[PDB]
Symmetry: C3
Subunit: 258 residues, 3 copies
């Protein structure tokens, strides 16, 4: 009785032996669910979805449904979810498009609060928190240890790098570099995520170097190239953590928040 008799499971589904599936769930074709995962009642896994281990998915979540992209033409595309994620009521996680790489991917140890939307072709890393009503549009790439405040929306193709923090009710139109606190509509940069650094017990020398690099990037009238060069020469040798900020600038395709 781990799988409720009222769950409707496509004959193609592959479900690990200790998986719990609650009443009235629907599991579509080509779905795999790994060990220790628990679905509550009333979960829909649309199709073509790989779910890892020890996940927990709550009622009224729509997981692995076809994307909202109007270019979509029925092509085979996928959603992947890693391990130890919490996916709350009324989330919507959509599959990829052929125009990108036919894949939406979420990593491990993520919290997706009520009504989190992960659009087609997002790539999301580990240990992220998406608060209530957060919308992540198509092709957005999110790193690790990011917090996205409630009722925020992220423009398609943005890159949201590790340890960043997005304030409640933000409209993110540009890339958010590593460690950066970005907030508002439209969102701008507000400093380094200091509290998050000290909450992970980060050193005085690290935080100070990252504060200096922030200043060089956002407040010193320097171009991206000039800022990177000054970080490399003055900060990176003793603060290797500064590399994540260099990466953000070098990988930015929409420009960065200001």
């Amino acid at each position: 009785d781990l799988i409720h008799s009222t769950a409707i499971i496509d004959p193609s589904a592959v479900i690990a032996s200790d998986v719990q599936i609650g009443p009235y769930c629907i599991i579509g074709p080509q779905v795999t669910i790994g060990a220790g995962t628990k679905l509550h009642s009333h979960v829909v896994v649309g199709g073509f979805t790989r779910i890892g281990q020890n996940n927990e998915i709550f009622q009224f979540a729509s997981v692995g449904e076809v994307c909202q992209d109007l270019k979509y033409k029925g092509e085979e595309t996928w959603l992947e979810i890693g391990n130890n994620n919490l996916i709350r009521e009324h989330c919507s996680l959509h599959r990829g498009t052929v125009q990108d790489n036919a894949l939406t991917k979420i990593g491990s140890h993520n919290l997706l609060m009520v009504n989190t939307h992960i659009a087609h072709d997002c790539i999301v890393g580990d240990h992220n928190i998406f608060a209530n009503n957060v919308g992540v549009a198509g092709h957005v790439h999110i790193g690790d240890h990011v917090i996205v405040g409630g009722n925020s929306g992220i423009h398609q193709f943005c890159k949201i790098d590790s340890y960043s923090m997005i304030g409640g009710a933000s409209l993110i139109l540009k890339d958010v570099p590593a460690y950066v606190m970005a907030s508002g509509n439209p969102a701008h940069a507000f400093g380094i995520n200091i509290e998050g650094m000290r909450r992970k017990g980060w050193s005085k020398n690290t935080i100070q170097g990252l504060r200096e690099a922030y200043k060089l990037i956002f407040k010193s009238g320097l171009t991206s190239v000039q800022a990177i060069d000054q970080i490399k020469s003055e900060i990176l040798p003793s603060v290797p953590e500064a590399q994540l900020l260099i990466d953000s600038l070098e990988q930015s395709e929409r420009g960065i928040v200001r």
Copy 2:
């Protein structure tokens, strides 16, 4: 002798005996179809769709899981009256949307046309009238008695105040709050929203003539950038633009039909 000649309606769907469902309609597991519902040919309901009652759904629609379609409205004045929701053809209604029936205080009718996309968690309140070829992005809230035209786009997490008229080819930016009427062709954005010109880019990509586009830009300037009253702007558009750019009539309509005033 008695063969079907065609699985389509899942056996777990609970369908009111008064419901009329076209023979090729697909209805997924655990759907609820209330009384006085009609569903047209080629329509597909996924699992877990609730159609509350008194709802007419047209042809070739697709309604996704956890949509609440044709439920009683949230107006505290509503007292259980048997009002209606009408949906046209070829609409895509995504997960968690909510479309509510009308009130007797207006015309007992919420109506949406055809070829619309309602993205995840689109809310259409009682007494809304929505046209064709519109796009509502995620988490859009359209309040009571709002009238939306054709070819409109409403960006994510936006809300539209009761009674506003959002005319054809307009665009509402993401994370916006619309408090007044948005005229035809107008880009409105912000909280509270202001007007930011004509959607030139759309028009160009759509192959509208350079003359049409220039005429609408000029009409916009008269309405928004010239210090003219509504009536003075209208009269100048009629005399100088309307003769070569009949498309400018939609802007005249917007100003003449406005009841809340226009977003500026």
Copy 3:
């Protein structure tokens, strides 16, 4: 009995497909629609109606004459990462309207292990009430309102659609929060707050008149507002000038004093 042209296509108060924990305590006339799930330690009072597809997770007390619509998740474990499976509760009073896709979460032991909602509230589609909120009576939450943890809401509050309220904020009685707002600080009684983030825009005059309040009462509240927000005065001095010049003739001004005294995040300005 028609033996010729009958349709022959067919009710119980509780649908056969509802799955109800045996520990549930359900009043005689309660209606529960198809496919509902009622978890352990749930009580539901007389006159209450659940539509189809309602989940009541557990450890929830629901009063009389409530109406809960499809896809509502009621009394589910909260989203606080601090929560570790402890016994915590949700209480709902009477005559509430809980619309589609609402989510109401139980408390945490870090507070008082209880989320509480009163009576005669309207929670429109996708209203989220986080762990440990306390909500009073006659409130209206418009579509897509997200109320974060430990928020205290009084009575007769209106929260506009697509708004958010930050954890620990106190939203006092008769206040009004505009559409698309983000509340970061406490909102005093009778105050109109609007914006992302929200700021104060005077007394909720229209709301008062709508409850039949006198012009003398209204003018007094406006004077008190002027003292708190516009008279270059400190919190303490404003309270004193209200106590000596307004509170005599306008006893309703006490709510505003309460707001200032009980504020822990500071007030919206």
